[PDB]
Amino acid sequence: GSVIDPSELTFVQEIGSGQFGLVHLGYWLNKDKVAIKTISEEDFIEEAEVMMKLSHPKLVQLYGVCLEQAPICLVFEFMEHGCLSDYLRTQRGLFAAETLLGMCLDVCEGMAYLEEACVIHRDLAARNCLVGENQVIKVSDFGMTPVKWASPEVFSFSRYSSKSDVWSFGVLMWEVFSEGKIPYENRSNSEVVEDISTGFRLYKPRLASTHVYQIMNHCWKERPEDRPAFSRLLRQLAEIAESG
Numbered sequence: 334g335s336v337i338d339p340s341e342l343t344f345v346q347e348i349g350s351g352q353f354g355l356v357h358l359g360y361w362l363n364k365d366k367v368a369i370k371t372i373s374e375e376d377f378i379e380e381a382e383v384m385m386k387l388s389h390p391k392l393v394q395l396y397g398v399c400l401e402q403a404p405i406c407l408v409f410e411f412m413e414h415g416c417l418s419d420y421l422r423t424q425r426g427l428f429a430a431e432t433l434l435g436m437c438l439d440v441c442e443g444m445a446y447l448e449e450a451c452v453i454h455r456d457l458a459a460r461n462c463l464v465g466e467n468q469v470i471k472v473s474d475f476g477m478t479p480v481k482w483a484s485p486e487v488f489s490f491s492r493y494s495s496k497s498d499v500w501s502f503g504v505l506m507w508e509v510f511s512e513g514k515i516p517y518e519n520r521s522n523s524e525v526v527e528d529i530s531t532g533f534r535l536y537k538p539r540l541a542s543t544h545v546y547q548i549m550n551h552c553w554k555e556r557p558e559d560r561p562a563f564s565r566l567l568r569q570l571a572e573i574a575e576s577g
């Protein structure tokens with residue numbers, strides 16, 4: 334299943350012995366697939382350290398930094414099938430509901446963890462999520478350093494927070510169950526501000542159950558203190574998936 338080429342192996346030294354042979358420390362030169370993001374100053378090598386402490390199975394992992402070369406780059410986990418929006422969209426018509434729920438769950442798990450660490454994503458939306466091995470979805474571009482995904486407090490009084498990420502997650506959910514359709518597709522920025530200000534919400538997608546629709550509208554309360562927190566969303570999304 335996983336046969337290793339001797340040439341990748343380097344015995345360094347013997348550390349003990351069993352009864353069928355002996356044991357060694359060695360190295361193994363792997364060849365990991367990676368995504369390399371080419372490019373402020375050197376204060377960003379501290380930036381890359383807070384990013385690197387943020388490890389979760391549903392957050393795209395930051396492997397390191399490259400600065401010797403010109404093209405100053407970050408090195409990231411490589412994600413098989415690229416961005417979830419494009420994925421939903423090129424694969425339209427082939428998803429089960431359950432699958433669409435499970436993508437939402439993956440995001441929510443990653444986001445609950447950002448919430449707990451007190452990292453505000455700020456630009457969550459499906460174009461910022463990547464699909465990996467077996468349609469696992471990972472949140473990305475939380476590193477750094479628009480209206481369709483903004484809470485009222487974000488276009489109004491620029492107040493960002495996890496509650497404002499919850500609004501983007503409501504929109505993301507709508508994106509997923511509608512299989513990658515663009516929200517407020519024809520509306521302009523002021524029209525969105527006005528409609529959302531008058532209590533209009535995005536319509537329920539066919540593939541989303543009324544229940545799932547309730548959670549979306551719940552992510553879209555007007556006042557953030559009224560929205561649920563990722564930790565709660567997560568328990569509710571996990572429950573629905575485990576039952577049936």
Ligand SMILES: O=S(=O)(c1ccccc1)c1cc(Nc2cc(-c3ccccc3)[nH]n2)nc(N[C@H]2CC[C@H](O)CC2)c1
Pocket residue numbers: 368370393409410411412413414415416463473474
């Ligand atoms: O499916 S892909 O077309 C593909 C390409 C070659 C072989 C097999 C598949 C593809 C995969 C990824 N994977 C990525 C991207 C990142 C990644 C990128 C930045 C930070 C961390 C990870 N990790 N893995 N990103 C793409 N474009 C990306 C271009 C930039 C944009 O942001 C998202 C789509 C496109």
